[PDB]
Design a binder for this molecule. Structure first.
Ligand SMILES: [Zn+2]
Ligand SMILES: [Zn+2]
Length: 49
């Protein structure tokens, strides 16, 4: 079928990117593995195991 995980958007308030970690509120939820990362930051964040 497809091994592509679907990401979602989230922005609480006091949350920080789990990749570059900076002043902002950007987060993405990856299923199959369950991870959090900037709106994208794919260049920094690793590959969804
Ligand atoms: Zn980031
Ligand atoms: Zn995943």
């Amino acid at each position: 079928g497809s091994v592509t995980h679907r990401f979602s958007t989230k922005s609480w308030l006091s949350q920080v990117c789990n990749v570059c970690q900076k002043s902002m509120i950007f987060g993405v939820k990856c299923k199959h593995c369950r991870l959090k990362c900037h709106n994208k930051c794919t260049k920094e964040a690793p590959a969804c195991r």
